[PDB]
Amino acid sequence: FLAKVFKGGVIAVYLSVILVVGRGLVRGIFTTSPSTVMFTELPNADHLLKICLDIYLVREAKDFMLEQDLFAKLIFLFRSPATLIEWTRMSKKKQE
Amino acid sequence: LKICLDIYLVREAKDFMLEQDLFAKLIFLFRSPATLIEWTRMSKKKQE
Amino acid sequence: ANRGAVLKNQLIEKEMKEQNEQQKAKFNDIRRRTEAIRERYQKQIERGAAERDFEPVTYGHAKRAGDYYMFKYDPENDDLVE
Amino acid sequence: ENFYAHIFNIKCARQFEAAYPAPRGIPKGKLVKYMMGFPIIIGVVIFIFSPLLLWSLLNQIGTISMPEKVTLRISIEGYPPLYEMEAQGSNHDNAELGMIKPDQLASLNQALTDSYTTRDTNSILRSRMSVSYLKGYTYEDILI
Amino acid sequence: VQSANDVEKMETAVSVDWQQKSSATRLLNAVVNCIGAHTDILCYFFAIMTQVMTGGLITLPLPLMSLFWGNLSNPRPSKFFWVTMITYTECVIVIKFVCQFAFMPYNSITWRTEHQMDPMSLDKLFGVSQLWDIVLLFSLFFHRYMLRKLGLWKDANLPIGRFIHQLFHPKFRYIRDLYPIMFGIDVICFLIMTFGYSAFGESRIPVTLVVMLVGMTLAIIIDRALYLRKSVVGKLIYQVLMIAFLHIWVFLVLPNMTRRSAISNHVAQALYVIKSCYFLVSAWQIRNGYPELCIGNLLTHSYGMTNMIAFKVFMNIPFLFELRTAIDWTWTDTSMPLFDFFNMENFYAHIFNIKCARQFEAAYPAPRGIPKGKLVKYMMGFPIIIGVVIFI
C-alpha cells in the first residue's frame, strides 16, 4: 500500500517535517537571536534573583503596597539595558 | 565585518588569547544599543 | 625545436618561481604586520582604564569581559602611516 | 513567573560553569571534541535519513501462493453452457494441474531462438523480445 | 616569432581576459594555444571516455594506469609511460578487431539470445568481445591524440623513487586552491544520485541500497572536509582507496545489484564520468602542495548579487549551516566550546547580509523626493497581489 501511494505526496510530507522541524526546533536551540544576548549573556545573575524572592516572600506576609512597588522595579530593568548591565556586573568579591 | 574577519584570521594563526578577547568585544556590542549606534554610523568619507 | 623551447621553458619557470616566492613573502609580512598592530592596539586600551578586576582562568569567565572602556576610540582614527 | 524562571536558569548555569572551570587559552582537547561534536553529527545524519530507512524496510514486497482451481466454459451467449470442465489439485503432481519439467522449458527456449531469418532485422528483434519475455519466469512459476 | 613561448602565463591570462566581453578574433587563437598546452589532460579524459564506452576489463588497465602512473608523476610522466600507453593502445585495437569476427561462438543463434539479460556473462566482463553500430570512435580519437602528444613533446621539449619525487622533491610548487571545484562536482553527483534513483534499484521500491549510497557520499564529503587541513598522506590514501572502490563498485557490483548491465545504464555512466573529473583535480592538488588556506566561506569574498542569492540558499536549507559549523568545529584548532562557535557564525552571517544589501542599494541609487514611478509600481505591487490571490 506504501507502493499504492503517490511519491509526490509522501516526499511532500517528508520534506515538510524536515523543514518544519529544522525551522522550529533545531534552529532555536543551536542559534540565539542577537536581541536575546542582552538577557542571556549576563555575567552574574544573583542580584536579580533577590528581587523575585523578595516579591514572593512579601506575597505571603500581606504588604500589597510592597508587592507592587518592587514588581514595578523589575519591569524597568527589562526596559533599560543600560541599568541591566549596571546591575548584572560582578561585585568586589570576584574583583579581589 | 572587520572584527569577524579578524577573529577568523586569528583562528588560523593560533593566538587563542586574541581569539577570546575580541569575541568578547562583539558580545557587548549586541548588549549595548548605545554603542552599536556609535559604531555603525557613517564615517568622514561619506560625510564629505 | 632543439634549442629555443627548453631555454625559454627554463627561463619562464625560474621567473615564475621568483615571483611566487616574492608574493608569499609579501603576504606573510603583511599578515605579521597587521597581527602586531592589532595586538598593540588591543593592549593599548586595556592599560588606559585598569579597573583592577582580574579574570579567573575560564572560557566564558573571560568571554564576558566586555565593557565601555574598550570602545573609546574612533573606529577609523588610526595613523599607521606617517 | 516567567521572569523568575529566566533568572533562575541563568544563575544555576553560572554555578555549573563555576563548579568545574577549565583553564583559559588552552585549545580544546581532542577527547572532548570527539565526544561532543561527533554525536551531534551522527544525530543529524540519522535524523535526516531515518524516514528513508523506515520506508525502505516498510515497503517489503510480498508473495502469494499459486492457483489450485481452474475452470473453463464454452457457450452461446444467453444460454446454459455447452461445455464446462474443472482442474483441481494442490500437490502439483497429477496430470490435470502440474508444474513444468526443465526439459520442456529448455525446448521452448531453444525453439524461440531459431525462429528468425538471416536477413531481416525485425525477425531478430522479435526473437530477442520473445526470449526476454520467457526468462522472467522460473520453472517454479509456470503451470501446465 | 617563436620567442612568444610564454604559453604557461597566457593560459591564465586569456582565461581572465575572456571572462569578460571580448568578441575579438584573438579568442580562437588563444583557445587553440590553451588546448595545445593542456593536451596532457585531454588524453586522460579520452581514456576515461573509452572505458565508459567499453564497460569491460580489456580496457580496464588504461584509466587505472593513467591515473596511478601519470597523474601521480610530479613534473611529467617521463616520456616512457607514453610508449607503454601507445603499445597497449595498439594492442587493444588489434585484439578487439580480431575479436570482432564471426566464426567464434558469438553468433546470432545461441550466444546473443542466452546472455541478453544477465549483466556479467563472459565476454562482457572481458571488454569488447560482443547489434553494434559504428561505436569505436573514442578508441580512434585516443590513438590520434596520443600521437599528437608525441608530436608536441618532440616539437618543443624532447616505487620509492616515485614517492620521494612526487612528495618531498618538487623543484616547483604552483600554489593553487581547488577545493570549491571538487565540492561542486560532489554536489552535482549528489543531485544526480538523488533525482535519479530508478536505475540504482532493480511503483517499485526506494530499496535499501540507495540509503547506503547516500550515507556513503555524505561520509566521503565529510572526510574531504577533514582532509582540507594539510593532510597529504591522508589525501593520497583517500584518493587511491576511492579510485579502487569506485571502479570496482561501478563495473563489478552495481550490475549484480540492479540487474542492469553496464553500457546500458545511462546514469551510472554520468556518475562515473563526473566522479573521474574529480580525481583529476584531486591529483593536481596532491602533486602541487597545499596552500596556506585562508579561512572563510567561498560565498563571501566579495559583496555582490550572486553572493546574496548564494548566502540566502546556504542559510535556507535546514541541517546545512549547522552541519557545516559542527564539522568545522570538530576539526579546527579553536578555543571556544560549540555554542560560542555557533553564535559567532550567526553574527558573521548577519553582518554580511547587511553589508551586501547596503552595497546593492548604493549600486543603483534613486533620486530622493520623487514619488515612485508608475512602471515600477505595476511590476512590483501587482505580482504579489496575484501571488496572494492564487496562493489562497
PDB file of N, CA and C in Angstrom, chain D residues 23-111:
ATOM      1  N   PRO D  23      40.967  25.849  32.267  1.00  0.00           N
ATOM      2  CA  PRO D  23      41.947  26.918  32.057  1.00  0.00           C
ATOM      3  C   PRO D  23      41.740  27.613  30.723  1.00  0.00           C
ATOM      4  N   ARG D  24      42.015  28.911  30.716  1.00  0.00           N
ATOM      5  CA  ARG D  24      41.807  29.710  29.525  1.00  0.00           C
ATOM      6  C   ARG D  24      43.010  29.624  28.593  1.00  0.00           C
ATOM      7  N   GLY D  25      42.760  29.898  27.315  1.00  0.00           N
ATOM      8  CA  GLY D  25      43.819  29.937  26.331  1.00  0.00           C
ATOM      9  C   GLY D  25      44.176  28.587  25.754  1.00  0.00           C
ATOM     10  N   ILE D  26      44.142  27.557  26.583  1.00  0.00           N
ATOM     11  CA  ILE D  26      44.439  26.207  26.103  1.00  0.00           C
ATOM     12  C   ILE D  26      43.387  25.807  25.074  1.00  0.00           C
ATOM     13  N   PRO D  27      43.782  25.363  23.885  1.00  0.00           N
ATOM     14  CA  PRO D  27      42.789  24.936  22.899  1.00  0.00           C
ATOM     15  C   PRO D  27      42.071  23.686  23.366  1.00  0.00           C
ATOM     16  N   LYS D  28      40.856  23.518  22.863  1.00  0.00           N
ATOM     17  CA  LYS D  28      40.003  22.434  23.331  1.00  0.00           C
ATOM     18  C   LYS D  28      40.676  21.091  23.095  1.00  0.00           C
ATOM     19  N   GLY D  29      40.598  20.218  24.093  1.00  0.00           N
ATOM     20  CA  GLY D  29      41.210  18.910  23.970  1.00  0.00           C
ATOM     21  C   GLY D  29      40.535  18.058  22.913  1.00  0.00           C
ATOM     22  N   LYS D  30      41.324  17.168  22.315  1.00  0.00           N
ATOM     23  CA  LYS D  30      40.796  16.292  21.277  1.00  0.00           C
ATOM     24  C   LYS D  30      39.715  15.373  21.828  1.00  0.00           C
ATOM     25  N   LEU D  31      39.902  14.885  23.057  1.00  0.00           N
ATOM     26  CA  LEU D  31      38.962  13.928  23.630  1.00  0.00           C
ATOM     27  C   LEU D  31      37.560  14.511  23.689  1.00  0.00           C
ATOM     28  N   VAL D  32      37.428  15.704  24.271  1.00  0.00           N
ATOM     29  CA  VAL D  32      36.106  16.304  24.425  1.00  0.00           C
ATOM     30  C   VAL D  32      35.495  16.616  23.064  1.00  0.00           C
ATOM     31  N   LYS D  33      36.327  17.005  22.091  1.00  0.00           N
ATOM     32  CA  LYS D  33      35.814  17.302  20.756  1.00  0.00           C
ATOM     33  C   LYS D  33      35.231  16.051  20.116  1.00  0.00           C
ATOM     34  N   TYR D  34      35.889  14.912  20.315  1.00  0.00           N
ATOM     35  CA  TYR D  34      35.385  13.663  19.760  1.00  0.00           C
ATOM     36  C   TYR D  34      34.133  13.180  20.482  1.00  0.00           C
ATOM     37  N   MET D  35      34.001  13.451  21.783  1.00  0.00           N
ATOM     38  CA  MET D  35      32.770  13.038  22.458  1.00  0.00           C
ATOM     39  C   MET D  35      31.630  14.045  22.339  1.00  0.00           C
ATOM     40  N   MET D  36      31.884  15.272  21.892  1.00  0.00           N
ATOM     41  CA  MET D  36      30.832  16.279  21.788  1.00  0.00           C
ATOM     42  C   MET D  36      30.399  16.562  20.357  1.00  0.00           C
ATOM     43  N   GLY D  37      31.344  16.804  19.443  1.00  0.00           N
ATOM     44  CA  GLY D  37      30.965  17.141  18.082  1.00  0.00           C
ATOM     45  C   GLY D  37      30.519  15.946  17.267  1.00  0.00           C
ATOM     46  N   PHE D  38      31.065  14.771  17.559  1.00  0.00           N
ATOM     47  CA  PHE D  38      30.681  13.547  16.869  1.00  0.00           C
ATOM     48  C   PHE D  38      29.197  13.245  17.043  1.00  0.00           C
ATOM     49  N   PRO D  39      28.701  13.041  18.286  1.00  0.00           N
ATOM     50  CA  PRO D  39      27.335  12.532  18.433  1.00  0.00           C
ATOM     51  C   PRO D  39      26.305  13.433  17.782  1.00  0.00           C
ATOM     52  N   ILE D  40      26.528  14.749  17.757  1.00  0.00           N
ATOM     53  CA  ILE D  40      25.586  15.621  17.065  1.00  0.00           C
ATOM     54  C   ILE D  40      25.641  15.397  15.558  1.00  0.00           C
ATOM     55  N   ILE D  41      26.820  15.076  15.016  1.00  0.00           N
ATOM     56  CA  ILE D  41      26.922  14.781  13.589  1.00  0.00           C
ATOM     57  C   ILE D  41      26.149  13.516  13.247  1.00  0.00           C
ATOM     58  N   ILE D  42      26.377  12.423  13.990  1.00  0.00           N
ATOM     59  CA  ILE D  42      25.570  11.237  13.691  1.00  0.00           C
ATOM     60  C   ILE D  42      24.097  11.485  13.995  1.00  0.00           C
ATOM     61  N   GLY D  43      23.788  12.314  14.990  1.00  0.00           N
ATOM     62  CA  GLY D  43      22.395  12.605  15.287  1.00  0.00           C
ATOM     63  C   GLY D  43      21.687  13.314  14.149  1.00  0.00           C
ATOM     64  N   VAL D  44      22.334  14.324  13.567  1.00  0.00           N
ATOM     65  CA  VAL D  44      21.755  14.996  12.411  1.00  0.00           C
ATOM     66  C   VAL D  44      21.636  14.029  11.240  1.00  0.00           C
ATOM     67  N   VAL D  45      22.655  13.185  11.045  1.00  0.00           N
ATOM     68  CA  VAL D  45      22.628  12.245   9.928  1.00  0.00           C
ATOM     69  C   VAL D  45      21.437  11.303  10.045  1.00  0.00           C
ATOM     70  N   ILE D  46      21.256  10.678  11.210  1.00  0.00           N
ATOM     71  CA  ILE D  46      20.177   9.700  11.275  1.00  0.00           C
ATOM     72  C   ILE D  46      18.833  10.391  11.440  1.00  0.00           C
ATOM     73  N   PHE D  47      18.842  11.659  11.865  1.00  0.00           N
ATOM     74  CA  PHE D  47      17.562  12.419  11.904  1.00  0.00           C
ATOM     75  C   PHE D  47      17.104  12.617  10.458  1.00  0.00           C
ATOM     76  N   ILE D  48      18.048  12.932   9.561  1.00  0.00           N
ATOM     77  CA  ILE D  48      17.700  13.135   8.161  1.00  0.00           C
ATOM     78  C   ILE D  48      17.296  11.816   7.511  1.00  0.00           C
ATOM     79  N   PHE D  49      18.066  10.753   7.743  1.00  0.00           N
ATOM     80  CA  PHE D  49      17.912   9.526   6.970  1.00  0.00           C
ATOM     81  C   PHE D  49      17.193   8.404   7.720  1.00  0.00           C
ATOM     82  N   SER D  50      16.500   8.709   8.808  1.00  0.00           N
ATOM     83  CA  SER D  50      15.704   7.668   9.452  1.00  0.00           C
ATOM     84  C   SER D  50      14.392   7.422   8.716  1.00  0.00           C
ATOM     85  N   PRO D  51      13.676   8.455   8.245  1.00  0.00           N
ATOM     86  CA  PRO D  51      12.455   8.164   7.480  1.00  0.00           C
ATOM     87  C   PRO D  51      12.712   7.345   6.231  1.00  0.00           C
ATOM     88  N   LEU D  52      13.839   7.572   5.554  1.00  0.00           N
ATOM     89  CA  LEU D  52      14.136   6.801   4.352  1.00  0.00           C
ATOM     90  C   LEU D  52      14.339   5.329   4.686  1.00  0.00           C
ATOM     91  N   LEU D  53      15.086   5.045   5.756  1.00  0.00           N
ATOM     92  CA  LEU D  53      15.296   3.661   6.171  1.00  0.00           C
ATOM     93  C   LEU D  53      13.982   3.020   6.589  1.00  0.00           C
ATOM     94  N   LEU D  54      13.151   3.762   7.325  1.00  0.00           N
ATOM     95  CA  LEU D  54      11.861   3.225   7.733  1.00  0.00           C
ATOM     96  C   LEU D  54      11.010   2.872   6.525  1.00  0.00           C
ATOM     97  N   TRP D  55      10.968   3.758   5.527  1.00  0.00           N
ATOM     98  CA  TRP D  55      10.185   3.479   4.328  1.00  0.00           C
ATOM     99  C   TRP D  55      10.731   2.278   3.570  1.00  0.00           C
ATOM    100  N   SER D  56      12.057   2.192   3.426  1.00  0.00           N
ATOM    101  CA  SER D  56      12.637   1.085   2.674  1.00  0.00           C
ATOM    102  C   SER D  56      12.346  -0.245   3.350  1.00  0.00           C
ATOM    103  N   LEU D  57      12.437  -0.295   4.679  1.00  0.00           N
ATOM    104  CA  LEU D  57      12.089  -1.526   5.375  1.00  0.00           C
ATOM    105  C   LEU D  57      10.588  -1.777   5.394  1.00  0.00           C
ATOM    106  N   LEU D  58       9.770  -0.732   5.253  1.00  0.00           N
ATOM    107  CA  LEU D  58       8.330  -0.904   5.367  1.00  0.00           C
ATOM    108  C   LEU D  58       7.680  -1.314   4.056  1.00  0.00           C
ATOM    109  N   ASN D  59       8.312  -1.026   2.915  1.00  0.00           N
ATOM    110  CA  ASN D  59       7.706  -1.395   1.639  1.00  0.00           C
ATOM    111  C   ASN D  59       7.515  -2.903   1.543  1.00  0.00           C
ATOM    112  N   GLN D  60       8.617  -3.654   1.510  1.00  0.00           N
ATOM    113  CA  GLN D  60       8.620  -5.102   1.720  1.00  0.00           C
ATOM    114  C   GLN D  60       7.604  -5.817   0.821  1.00  0.00           C
ATOM    115  N   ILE D  61       7.904  -5.801  -0.480  1.00  0.00           N
ATOM    116  CA  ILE D  61       7.066  -6.508  -1.444  1.00  0.00           C
ATOM    117  C   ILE D  61       6.920  -7.969  -1.035  1.00  0.00           C
ATOM    118  N   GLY D  62       5.697  -8.486  -1.138  1.00  0.00           N
ATOM    119  CA  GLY D  62       5.368  -9.816  -0.685  1.00  0.00           C
ATOM    120  C   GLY D  62       5.112 -10.792  -1.824  1.00  0.00           C
ATOM    121  N   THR D  63       4.687 -11.992  -1.436  1.00  0.00           N
ATOM    122  CA  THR D  63       4.383 -13.058  -2.376  1.00  0.00           C
ATOM    123  C   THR D  63       3.071 -13.732  -1.992  1.00  0.00           C
ATOM    124  N   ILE D  64       2.422 -14.330  -2.993  1.00  0.00           N
ATOM    125  CA  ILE D  64       1.165 -15.043  -2.810  1.00  0.00           C
ATOM    126  C   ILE D  64       1.272 -16.408  -3.475  1.00  0.00           C
ATOM    127  N   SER D  65       0.424 -17.329  -3.029  1.00  0.00           N
ATOM    128  CA  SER D  65       0.514 -18.715  -3.458  1.00  0.00           C
ATOM    129  C   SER D  65      -0.054 -18.898  -4.864  1.00  0.00           C
ATOM    130  N   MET D  66       0.268 -20.044  -5.458  1.00  0.00           N
ATOM    131  CA  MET D  66      -0.139 -20.391  -6.808  1.00  0.00           C
ATOM    132  C   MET D  66      -1.586 -20.886  -6.840  1.00  0.00           C
ATOM    133  N   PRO D  67      -2.259 -20.758  -7.985  1.00  0.00           N
ATOM    134  CA  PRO D  67      -3.647 -21.218  -8.076  1.00  0.00           C
ATOM    135  C   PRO D  67      -3.754 -22.727  -7.925  1.00  0.00           C
ATOM    136  N   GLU D  68      -4.902 -23.171  -7.410  1.00  0.00           N
ATOM    137  CA  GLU D  68      -5.214 -24.591  -7.379  1.00  0.00           C
ATOM    138  C   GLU D  68      -6.425 -24.968  -8.213  1.00  0.00           C
ATOM    139  N   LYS D  69      -7.321 -24.031  -8.501  1.00  0.00           N
ATOM    140  CA  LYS D  69      -8.569 -24.322  -9.185  1.00  0.00           C
ATOM    141  C   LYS D  69      -8.648 -23.513 -10.474  1.00  0.00           C
ATOM    142  N   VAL D  70      -8.893 -24.198 -11.591  1.00  0.00           N
ATOM    143  CA  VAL D  70      -9.021 -23.572 -12.903  1.00  0.00           C
ATOM    144  C   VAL D  70     -10.269 -24.112 -13.583  1.00  0.00           C
ATOM    145  N   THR D  71     -11.059 -23.213 -14.172  1.00  0.00           N
ATOM    146  CA  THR D  71     -12.327 -23.561 -14.802  1.00  0.00           C
ATOM    147  C   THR D  71     -12.374 -23.027 -16.226  1.00  0.00           C
ATOM    148  N   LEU D  72     -13.085 -23.741 -17.097  1.00  0.00           N
ATOM    149  CA  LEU D  72     -13.277 -23.351 -18.484  1.00  0.00           C
ATOM    150  C   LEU D  72     -14.728 -23.590 -18.875  1.00  0.00           C
ATOM    151  N   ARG D  73     -15.277 -22.686 -19.685  1.00  0.00           N
ATOM    152  CA  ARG D  73     -16.661 -22.769 -20.128  1.00  0.00           C
ATOM    153  C   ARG D  73     -16.763 -22.319 -21.577  1.00  0.00           C
ATOM    154  N   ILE D  74     -17.591 -23.012 -22.351  1.00  0.00           N
ATOM    155  CA  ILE D  74     -17.849 -22.677 -23.746  1.00  0.00           C
ATOM    156  C   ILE D  74     -19.353 -22.653 -23.955  1.00  0.00           C
ATOM    157  N   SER D  75     -19.867 -21.548 -24.493  1.00  0.00           N
ATOM    158  CA  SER D  75     -21.308 -21.385 -24.587  1.00  0.00           C
ATOM    159  C   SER D  75     -21.667 -20.434 -25.716  1.00  0.00           C
ATOM    160  N   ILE D  76     -22.916 -20.535 -26.161  1.00  0.00           N
ATOM    161  CA  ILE D  76     -23.547 -19.495 -26.960  1.00  0.00           C
ATOM    162  C   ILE D  76     -24.185 -18.505 -25.997  1.00  0.00           C
ATOM    163  N   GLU D  77     -23.978 -17.216 -26.249  1.00  0.00           N
ATOM    164  CA  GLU D  77     -24.357 -16.187 -25.292  1.00  0.00           C
ATOM    165  C   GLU D  77     -25.849 -16.225 -24.986  1.00  0.00           C
ATOM    166  N   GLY D  78     -26.179 -16.083 -23.707  1.00  0.00           N
ATOM    167  CA  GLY D  78     -27.558 -16.060 -23.270  1.00  0.00           C
ATOM    168  C   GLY D  78     -28.202 -17.408 -23.065  1.00  0.00           C
ATOM    169  N   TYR D  79     -27.422 -18.458 -22.834  1.00  0.00           N
ATOM    170  CA  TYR D  79     -27.960 -19.806 -22.744  1.00  0.00           C
ATOM    171  C   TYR D  79     -27.087 -20.628 -21.810  1.00  0.00           C
ATOM    172  N   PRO D  80     -27.585 -21.767 -21.327  1.00  0.00           N
ATOM    173  CA  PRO D  80     -26.757 -22.629 -20.486  1.00  0.00           C
ATOM    174  C   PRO D  80     -25.513 -23.074 -21.211  1.00  0.00           C
ATOM    175  N   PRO D  81     -24.407 -23.279 -20.487  1.00  0.00           N
ATOM    176  CA  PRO D  81     -23.139 -23.610 -21.140  1.00  0.00           C
ATOM    177  C   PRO D  81     -23.191 -24.945 -21.861  1.00  0.00           C
ATOM    178  N   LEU D  82     -22.473 -25.019 -22.981  1.00  0.00           N
ATOM    179  CA  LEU D  82     -22.397 -26.236 -23.777  1.00  0.00           C
ATOM    180  C   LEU D  82     -21.337 -27.195 -23.267  1.00  0.00           C
ATOM    181  N   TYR D  83     -20.303 -26.671 -22.619  1.00  0.00           N
ATOM    182  CA  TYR D  83     -19.204 -27.455 -22.089  1.00  0.00           C
ATOM    183  C   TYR D  83     -18.699 -26.744 -20.846  1.00  0.00           C
ATOM    184  N   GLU D  84     -18.319 -27.516 -19.832  1.00  0.00           N
ATOM    185  CA  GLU D  84     -17.654 -26.963 -18.662  1.00  0.00           C
ATOM    186  C   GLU D  84     -16.771 -28.037 -18.049  1.00  0.00           C
ATOM    187  N   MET D  85     -15.614 -27.613 -17.546  1.00  0.00           N
ATOM    188  CA  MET D  85     -14.639 -28.558 -17.028  1.00  0.00           C
ATOM    189  C   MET D  85     -13.871 -27.925 -15.878  1.00  0.00           C
ATOM    190  N   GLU D  86     -13.289 -28.786 -15.055  1.00  0.00           N
ATOM    191  CA  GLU D  86     -12.659 -28.445 -13.792  1.00  0.00           C
ATOM    192  C   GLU D  86     -11.278 -29.087 -13.743  1.00  0.00           C
ATOM    193  N   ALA D  87     -10.323 -28.397 -13.128  1.00  0.00           N
ATOM    194  CA  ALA D  87      -8.965 -28.928 -12.974  1.00  0.00           C
ATOM    195  C   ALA D  87      -8.464 -28.533 -11.586  1.00  0.00           C
ATOM    196  N   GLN D  88      -8.667 -29.420 -10.619  1.00  0.00           N
ATOM    197  CA  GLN D  88      -8.258 -29.206  -9.237  1.00  0.00           C
ATOM    198  C   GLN D  88      -6.947 -29.925  -8.952  1.00  0.00           C
ATOM    199  N   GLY D  89      -6.367 -29.604  -7.799  1.00  0.00           N
ATOM    200  CA  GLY D  89      -5.125 -30.222  -7.386  1.00  0.00           C
ATOM    201  C   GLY D  89      -4.181 -29.266  -6.689  1.00  0.00           C
ATOM    202  N   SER D  90      -3.615 -29.697  -5.561  1.00  0.00           N
ATOM    203  CA  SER D  90      -2.675 -28.883  -4.806  1.00  0.00           C
ATOM    204  C   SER D  90      -1.277 -29.476  -4.712  1.00  0.00           C
ATOM    205  N   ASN D  91      -1.114 -30.780  -4.938  1.00  0.00           N
ATOM    206  CA  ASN D  91       0.203 -31.402  -4.880  1.00  0.00           C
ATOM    207  C   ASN D  91       1.065 -31.078  -6.091  1.00  0.00           C
ATOM    208  N   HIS D  92       0.472 -30.554  -7.167  1.00  0.00           N
ATOM    209  CA  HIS D  92       1.196 -30.224  -8.397  1.00  0.00           C
ATOM    210  C   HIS D  92       1.929 -31.444  -8.950  1.00  0.00           C
ATOM    211  N   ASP D  93       1.283 -32.603  -8.859  1.00  0.00           N
ATOM    212  CA  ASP D  93       1.827 -33.854  -9.364  1.00  0.00           C
ATOM    213  C   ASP D  93       0.932 -34.541 -10.384  1.00  0.00           C
ATOM    214  N   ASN D  94      -0.388 -34.434 -10.242  1.00  0.00           N
ATOM    215  CA  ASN D  94      -1.297 -35.048 -11.195  1.00  0.00           C
ATOM    216  C   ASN D  94      -1.215 -34.347 -12.546  1.00  0.00           C
ATOM    217  N   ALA D  95      -1.623 -35.071 -13.591  1.00  0.00           N
ATOM    218  CA  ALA D  95      -1.521 -34.544 -14.946  1.00  0.00           C
ATOM    219  C   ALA D  95      -2.472 -33.383 -15.199  1.00  0.00           C
ATOM    220  N   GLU D  96      -3.568 -33.287 -14.442  1.00  0.00           N
ATOM    221  CA  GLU D  96      -4.536 -32.220 -14.676  1.00  0.00           C
ATOM    222  C   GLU D  96      -3.931 -30.851 -14.406  1.00  0.00           C
ATOM    223  N   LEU D  97      -3.164 -30.723 -13.332  1.00  0.00           N
ATOM    224  CA  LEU D  97      -2.582 -29.441 -12.953  1.00  0.00           C
ATOM    225  C   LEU D  97      -1.218 -29.721 -12.347  1.00  0.00           C
ATOM    226  N   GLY D  98      -0.163 -29.343 -13.055  1.00  0.00           N
ATOM    227  CA  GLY D  98       1.175 -29.628 -12.577  1.00  0.00           C
ATOM    228  C   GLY D  98       2.162 -28.635 -13.136  1.00  0.00           C
ATOM    229  N   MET D  99       3.375 -28.702 -12.604  1.00  0.00           N
ATOM    230  CA  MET D  99       4.433 -27.787 -12.992  1.00  0.00           C
ATOM    231  C   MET D  99       5.038 -28.252 -14.316  1.00  0.00           C
ATOM    232  N   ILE D 100       6.166 -27.662 -14.696  1.00  0.00           N
ATOM    233  CA  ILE D 100       6.814 -27.945 -15.968  1.00  0.00           C
ATOM    234  C   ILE D 100       8.214 -28.473 -15.686  1.00  0.00           C
ATOM    235  N   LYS D 101       8.574 -29.570 -16.341  1.00  0.00           N
ATOM    236  CA  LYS D 101       9.923 -30.085 -16.229  1.00  0.00           C
ATOM    237  C   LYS D 101      10.900 -29.135 -16.921  1.00  0.00           C
ATOM    238  N   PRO D 102      12.136 -29.042 -16.428  1.00  0.00           N
ATOM    239  CA  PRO D 102      13.110 -28.147 -17.080  1.00  0.00           C
ATOM    240  C   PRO D 102      13.425 -28.528 -18.519  1.00  0.00           C
ATOM    241  N   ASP D 103      13.212 -29.788 -18.903  1.00  0.00           N
ATOM    242  CA  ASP D 103      13.421 -30.180 -20.292  1.00  0.00           C
ATOM    243  C   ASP D 103      12.464 -29.451 -21.227  1.00  0.00           C
ATOM    244  N   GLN D 104      11.184 -29.355 -20.848  1.00  0.00           N
ATOM    245  CA  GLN D 104      10.214 -28.659 -21.686  1.00  0.00           C
ATOM    246  C   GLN D 104      10.526 -27.169 -21.789  1.00  0.00           C
ATOM    247  N   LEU D 105      10.928 -26.545 -20.679  1.00  0.00           N
ATOM    248  CA  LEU D 105      11.294 -25.133 -20.722  1.00  0.00           C
ATOM    249  C   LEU D 105      12.516 -24.908 -21.605  1.00  0.00           C
ATOM    250  N   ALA D 106      13.515 -25.789 -21.500  1.00  0.00           N
ATOM    251  CA  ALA D 106      14.689 -25.678 -22.357  1.00  0.00           C
ATOM    252  C   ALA D 106      14.320 -25.848 -23.826  1.00  0.00           C
ATOM    253  N   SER D 107      13.425 -26.792 -24.128  1.00  0.00           N
ATOM    254  CA  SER D 107      12.995 -26.984 -25.509  1.00  0.00           C
ATOM    255  C   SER D 107      12.288 -25.750 -26.052  1.00  0.00           C
ATOM    256  N   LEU D 108      11.396 -25.159 -25.258  1.00  0.00           N
ATOM    257  CA  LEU D 108      10.702 -23.954 -25.705  1.00  0.00           C
ATOM    258  C   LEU D 108      11.683 -22.816 -25.944  1.00  0.00           C
ATOM    259  N   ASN D 109      12.615 -22.614 -25.010  1.00  0.00           N
ATOM    260  CA  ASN D 109      13.579 -21.529 -25.163  1.00  0.00           C
ATOM    261  C   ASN D 109      14.468 -21.744 -26.383  1.00  0.00           C
ATOM    262  N   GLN D 110      14.895 -22.987 -26.622  1.00  0.00           N
ATOM    263  CA  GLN D 110      15.711 -23.274 -27.795  1.00  0.00           C
ATOM    264  C   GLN D 110      14.936 -23.023 -29.080  1.00  0.00           C
ATOM    265  N   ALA D 111      13.662 -23.407 -29.109  1.00  0.00           N
ATOM    266  CA  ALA D 111      12.846 -23.140 -30.284  1.00  0.00           C
ATOM    267  C   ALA D 111      12.619 -21.654 -30.516  1.00  0.00           C
TER     268      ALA D 111
END
